[PDB]
């Protein structure tokens, strides 16, 4: 009975916020009565919340032994194992919880999250539906199921589903509970900007709550650049320094910073993955700090502060591997959101969001908690000029002139063409054309036979579908290919006599309105196909069914598997036009398609995520590809697929402008970022709180 | 139509064995008609069988695009991805195959194998049952389901299940088809020795078939030791040089070889896992070769032959990471099976099996294809004296004398005891006893509160349940613990006033007859419990149900979670007696329990796997623990649990003999292995084919 009262006191002190006094009291309850399942389970939950996972695990093991019918302890132990990256262990725990209590809705939902995170969406959907059958009012399961359904393009009762998600978010925000819709997913649903910002703010508040327990005082920040010899100390914080889209966009930036005025510190949140992306950033940053070896957020923020960082850059936001607790501790006087997260942090600890006038017009400042800090063209950047220089030029094979039926690319392409007798130069730079002779026959024979490579006049001619077999580092974009590569419509089953509209994003970005817009375009352009990716393959039958319901036969939509990085960018040259997703645009994917010289049609919305593609196109200098409404989006796409002279003009404009415009110019981008940094600094140094940097 | 005939010719040449002519003909069929789904699918299967997985994947991608209803191509592509270690990709493919054809039994079975290999046995069982519902006559699914059922101790219609497995194996052997029962699992079922050997032989034949395509001539072998300066070149081939039971048994052996007469080459089949086990073998072998970097079996066997190996040692047999194709190529004149595989290879390319008279009596030579090569005591060895020297001595705390209620172990235990005032020495070496005073109270308080560690007289006193939090390398056995560790019955919920019978093996080793024997023992010894492991936890409710059906209440069986290596060995000191599994004995597990000084009761069978424990006990010098039949096994176990003076005598015998006997003496073992090697060599050098080395 004394142990019961001690457990009650610990629970009181826990609610107050005194976690250390709660721990001491739970231990005293165990000292009095060691076989106390509830005290062990409560102490374990408290330790789990403190991030003391191994210690929490000891107490969960005690609870499960003492009470073998304690399904709740198995489920909670499963949650601790999942956080410890023991996926098999977590699954075993949720499995046992469901066996002990088949009516335990939470355990089914937690099991569904393992299937979801392991990529098994149909099993995740089945387990979430069981959870909701058992507990109809279950916001976590409903919202997680809605995201599974979004991933596979299951649009059954879509409008009602969207209304219920908004209703769930509204109730959770009103009742001061953490919303079940993740902030990174909030742009996919028709939530208000106010709701999307409030969800983000609640996630930011979790970070503040986790750091307030460290009882750390506010840091003394530098007030000048004297101790740094007139240099601005910029700290880039990312879990994505390695093989990840973030590095594929910005890996050249640290090394392009001016050492006379800037000192670059890269804070890695992930261990070294052995890739060239990680090698490059480690070799080129002035300082590289592996924070994955410092799990304590207090010690890691102390490390950042010790380095004397003036501007700390958040490249994660609410994405995998984030440690926003570092930013919540405020180790730097200026903290800015940049590139990795397409939305507001909603957090008071973030001062700025690096964006642009096209992506984030001054009118929509209300959607963001941060002050707007404008880059002059687009905040978007890509490392395509460095990673894929073999795609700067191309040659074609005339198999009957088409620029996207049979394509050649390579560092040594000019030398190869010079070894050939009857090459024609079509003025656009310029496009060399190889005629349908002996050399052209040998190339098509290789593709048809599935041969990996051939030799022509001593030159290495590679099948574009076999890059992983030739050079795996070139396939991933870690190395520039050293052979001449052949890319053809026949490699993907694309028609030689029709217009190819493409979209290479994950299928979750498509919604019913978007597929209807695309169906309207296809119906208006008889000789046309829509080229999509099995991203995931389980979404393919759903898209095909909705397309069939819209009146499109199976042959109007062509699916390809997701390809290695280099092949994905290179095969974009086969399309005529890219049809961008208005719900959430292609971001890295938009840069990929434009590097191939493919015009992209977009309809910018209101959210940051729905406006990126129009910002990329504005920078490129292709205003005619930006639609104000659905009818204009269809009209632009149909004009491109039917007015062939106009298509030629636009493809030529994209081909030239990816070089002449600032879009892929990493040096210019770094210099403009530096100008923006100095503006932020001079504003703070003069004793001012953050304000919009919009000129 | 010409493409149809070309595909038919390729199929003919494929059946003949001419794989290269088949490839050339499939490519010619594709040259004529590129959109040929069947030719792509056949070429992909051919390439997959050749081990050309990336190339096979290109052709499967073609087949699936051309024929979207080709469920067979999705399933086969899934098999290629599984072999490539792309588990998520494989699952996606099997998922698509089942969506395309819900009646496709093979795809359900392949999906069940992913759930099985990922540890999700209930989902594996559900998918195998769907496969068998769809196709009742399905040997692969039936046998794989039988193994899932064995893992979880599901004994529904067990006798009929065992009869069906034997019937399936009999039919497959008769019809010259690869048996569906894996040779590594064959000892778990009541198959004849002839059938178990024939299953093994069929697996050995797969290796020969895979190497015959390389068209490699027989290697010229050394006929003397002149080129090796009178030294015998011994090559240890293993995928387990790292954190694995194999290294926990033999890691000290390479470094203990006599360099004047032996030259040791360790051929690793696995990449470096970063553990101290891999460090030790790399540092101590005369040569360490990483064959994981040489995927071609032809090039890897050429490497072994180039090194001039006289005796090549197979430490895998039919276990994970094996490359038995290396042995099928015969790069060495003498090839021996050793330690890792508890059965016959059934293969003509293996000359010897290193065993002993107890494990493999001369009478049962017929069970093995290899000639018997006897070690003088047991072929079994363990690295316990090197890995766990802190368990060589122990002290107890008298909480009321018991040797297994509250135990202390540590390198500095003597110094700690010397700092204490009233320590009593109980003559057995000897056992120090600490009385129930201030120091004894502080220890129990730590355990009850779940505290990680305390300090007594400047000595570090660690909670045995918290080793991963104190020193993770000490928890895994990579380092010797540097603190004094406390192990108690209260840490595991074991009764302070009863006999503890234990079994720490994976639950698959238990069968109905074994659990009945154990129930008979428990019923005869009122003050007793059976201590088992959640190995896996999903087996716990099945064991508890069968025990309840046998008339044992829930409280007679205590389950603990699987523990880190050091904790598992150390906690064995808490038991009174180990009850060994007669179906398949504890092998590494038997060595673990004996190092704790725990008497193990065994009933040796006929298979190698069912006789290891009696061989370990014979070496130890505990003949009285070996039962001739079930009644004697129960009688021995009951005598140990009721005649307390006899129990004391036997526990004392085990405690002393683990040191004085040859059991854990790695130096003596290496020297005896060397004597055996020279016998094998002198026999071959004299121009003789292998014969039994039994004296």
């Amino acid at each position: 009975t004394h142990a019961d009262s001690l457990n009650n006191l610990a629970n009181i002190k826990r609610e107050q916020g005194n976690i250390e006094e709660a721990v001491r009291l739970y231990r005293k309850a165990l000292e009095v009565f060691p076989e106390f399942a509830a005290a062990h389970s409560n102490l374990a939950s408290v330790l789990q919340q403190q991030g003391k996972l191994q210690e929490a695990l000891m107490h969960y093991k005690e609870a499960i032994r003492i009470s073998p019918t304690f399904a709740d302890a198995y489920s909670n132990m499963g949650n601790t194992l999942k956080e410890m990256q023991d996926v098999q262990g977590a699954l075993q725990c949720y499995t046992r919880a469901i066996q002990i209590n088949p009516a335990f809705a939470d355990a089914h939902s937690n099991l569904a999250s393992i299937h979801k995170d392991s990529g098994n969406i149909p099993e995740a959907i089945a387990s979430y539906r069981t959870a909701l059958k058992l507990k109809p009012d279950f916001p976590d399961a409903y919202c997680n199921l809605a995201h599974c359904l979004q991933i596979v393009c299951d649009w059954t009762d879509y409008d009602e589903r969207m209304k219920k998600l908004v209703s769930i978010v509204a109730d959770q925000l009103e009742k001061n509970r953490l919303p079940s819709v993740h902030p990174h997913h909030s742009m996919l649903y028709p939530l208000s900007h106010g709701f999307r910002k409030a969800i983000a703010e609640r996630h930011g508040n979790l970070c503040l709550d986790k750091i307030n327990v460290l009882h750390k005082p506010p840091y003394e920040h530098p007030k000048d650049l004297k101790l740094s010899d007139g240099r601005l100390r910029v700290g880039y914080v990312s879990s994505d320094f390695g093989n990840h889209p973030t590095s594929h966009l910005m890996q050249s930036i640290p090394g392009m910073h001016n050492p006379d005025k800037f000192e670059v510190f890269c804070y890695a949140l992930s261990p070294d993955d052995g890739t060239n992306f990680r090698v490059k950033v480690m070799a080129e940053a002035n300082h590289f700090i592996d924070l994955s070896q410092i799990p304590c957020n207090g010690k890691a923020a102390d490390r950042i502060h010790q380095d004397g960082i003036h501007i700390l850059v958040n490249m994660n936001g609410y994405t995998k591997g984030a440690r926003n607790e570092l930013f919540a501790l405020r180790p730097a006087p200026i903290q800015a959101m940049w590139l990795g997260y397409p939305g507001t942090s909603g957090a008071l600890f973030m001062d700025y969001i690096i964006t642009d006038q096209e992506t984030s017009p001054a009118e929509v400042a209300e959607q963001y908690s941060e002050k707007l800090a404008y880059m002059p063209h687009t905040f978007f950047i890509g490392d395509h000029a460095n990673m894929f220089p073999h795609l700067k030029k191309k040659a074609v094979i005339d198999f009957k002139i088409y620029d996207n039926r049979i394509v050649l690319n390579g560092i040594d392409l000019k030398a190869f063409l010079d070894s050939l007798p009857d090459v024609k130069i079509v003025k656009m730079l310029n496009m060399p054309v190889i005629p349908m002779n002996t050399i052209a026959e040998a190339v098509i024979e290789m593709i048809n036979r599935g041969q990996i490579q051939i030799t022509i006049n001593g030159f290495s001619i590679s099948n574009g579908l076999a890059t992983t077999q030739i050079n795996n580092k070139a396939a991933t974009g870690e190395e520039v290919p050293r052979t001449i590569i052949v890319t053809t419509r026949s490699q993907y089953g694309l028609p030689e006599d029709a217009i190819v509209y493409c979209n290479f994003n994950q299928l979750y970005k498509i919604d019913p309105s978007t597929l209807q817009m695309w169906a309207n375009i296809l119906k208006r352009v008889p000789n046309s196909v829509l080229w999509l990716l099995r991203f995931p393959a389980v979404g393919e039958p759903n898209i095909q069914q909705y397309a069939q319901n819209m009146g499109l036969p199976q042959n109007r939509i062509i699916f390809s598997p997701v390809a290695p990085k280099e092949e994905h960018v290179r095969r974009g040259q086969l399309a005529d036009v890219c049809l961008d997703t208005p719900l959430c645009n292609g971001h890295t994917t938009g840069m990929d398609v434009l590097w191939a010289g493919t015009p992209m049609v977009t309809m910018p919305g209101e959210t940051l995520a729905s406006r990126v593609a129009a910002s990329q196109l504005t920078c490129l200098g292709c205003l005619e590809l930006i639609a104000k409404n659905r009818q204009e989006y269809e009209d632009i796409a149909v004009k491109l697929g039917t007015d062939l002279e106009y298509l030629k003009k636009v493809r030529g404009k994209v081909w030239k402008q990816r070089i002449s415009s600032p879009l892929f110019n990493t040096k210019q981008y770094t210099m403009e970022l530096e100008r923006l940094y100095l503006q932020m600094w001079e504003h703070y140094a003069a004793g001012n709180k953050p304000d919009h940097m919009i000129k | 139509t010409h493409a149809d005939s070309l595909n038919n010719l390729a199929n003919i040449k494929r059946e003949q064995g001419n794989i290269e002519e088949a490839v050339r003909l499939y490519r010619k069929a594709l040259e004529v008609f590129p959109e040929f789904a069947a030719a792509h699918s056949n070429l992909a299967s051919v390439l997959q069988q050749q081990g050309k997985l990336q190339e096979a994947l290109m052709h499967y991608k073609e087949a699936i695009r051309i024929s979207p209803t080709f469920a067979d191509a999705y399933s086969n592509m899934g098999n290629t991805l599984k072999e490539m270690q792309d588990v998520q990709g494989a699952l996606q493919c099997y998922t698509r195959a089942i969506q395309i054809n819900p009646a496709f039994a093979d795809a359900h079975s392949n999906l069940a194998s992913i759930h099985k290999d990922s540890g999700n046995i209930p989902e594996a069982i559900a998918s195998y049952r769907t496969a068998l519902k769809l196709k009742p006559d399905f040997p692969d699914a039936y046998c794989n389901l039988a193994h899932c059922l064995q893992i979880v101790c599901d004994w529904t219609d067990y006798d009929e299940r065992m009869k069906k497995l034997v019937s399936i194996v009999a039919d497959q052997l008769e019809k010259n088809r690869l048996p569906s029962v894996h040779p590594h699992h064959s000892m778990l079922y009541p198959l004849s020795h002839g059938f178990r050997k024939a299953i093994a032989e069929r697996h050995g034949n797969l290796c020969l078939d895979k190497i015959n395509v390389l068209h490699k001539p027989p290697y010229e072998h050394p006929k003397d030791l002149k080129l090796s300066d009178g030294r015998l070149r011994v090559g240890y081939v293993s995928s387990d040089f790292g954190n694995h039971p194999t290294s926990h048994l033999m890691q000290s052996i390479p470094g203990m070889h006599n360099p004047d007469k032996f030259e040791v080459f360790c051929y690793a089949l696995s990449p470096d896992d970063g553990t101290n086990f891999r460090v030790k073998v790399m540092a101590e072998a005369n040569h360490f070769i990483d064959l994981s970097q040489i995927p071609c079996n032809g090039k890897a066997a050429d490497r072994i032959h180039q090194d001039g190996i006289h005796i090549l040692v197979n430490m895998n047999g039919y276990t994970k990471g094996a490359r038995n194709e290396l042995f099928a190529l015969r790069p060495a004149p003498i090839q021996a099976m050793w330690l890792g595989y508890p059965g016959t290879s059934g293969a003509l390319f293996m000359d010897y099996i290193i065993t002993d008279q107890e494990t493999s009596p001369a009478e049962v030579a017929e069970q093995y294809s290899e000639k018997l090569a006897y070690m003088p005591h047991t072929f079994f060895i363990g690295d316990h004296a090197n890995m766990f020297p802190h368990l060589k001595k122990k002290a107890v705390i008298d909480f009321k004398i018991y040797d297994n209620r509250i135990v202390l172990n540590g390198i500095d235990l003597k110094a700690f005891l010397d700092s204490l005032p009233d320590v009593k020495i109980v003559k057995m070496l000897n056992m120090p006893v600490i009385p129930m005073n201030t120091i004894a109270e502080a220890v129990i308080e730590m355990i009850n509160r779940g505290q990680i560690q305390i300090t007594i007289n400047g000595f570090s006193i660690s909670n045995g349940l918290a080793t991963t939090q104190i020193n993770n390398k000490a928890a895994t056995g990579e380092e010797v613990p540097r603190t004094i560790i406390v192990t108690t019955r209260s840490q595991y919920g074991l009764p302070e006033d009863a006999i503890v019978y234990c079994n720490f093996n994976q639950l698959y080793k238990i069968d109905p007859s074994t659990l009945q024997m154990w129930a008979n023992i428990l019923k005869r010894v009122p003050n007793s419990v059976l201590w088992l492991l959640r190995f896996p936890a999903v087996g716990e409710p099945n064991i508890q149900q069968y025990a309840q059906n046998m008339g044992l209440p829930q409280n007679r069986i205590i389950f603990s979670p699987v523990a880190p290596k050091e904790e598992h060995v150390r906690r064995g000191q808490l038991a009174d007696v180990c009850l060994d599994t007669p179906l398949c004995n504890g092998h590494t597990t038997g060595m673990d329990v004996l190092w704790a000084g725990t008497p193990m009761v065994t009933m040796p069978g006929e298979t190698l796997a069912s006789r290891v424990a009696a061989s370990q006990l014979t070496c130890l010098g505990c003949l009285e623990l070996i039962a001739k039949n079930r009644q004697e096994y129960e009688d021995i176990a009951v005598k140990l649990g009721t005649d307390l003076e006899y129990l004391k005598k036997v526990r004392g015998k085990v405690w002393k003999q683990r040191i004085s006997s040859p059991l854990f003496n790695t130096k003596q073992y290496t020297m005896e292995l060397e004597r055996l090697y020279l016998q094998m060599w002198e026999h071959y050098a004299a121009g003789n084919k292998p014969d039994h080395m039994i004296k």
Partner: peptide, 14 residues
Amino acid sequence: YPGGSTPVSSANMM
């Protein structure tokens, strides 16, 4: 990609 990996931007656990 099938037979390898295609890293993507994804949500952190909550």
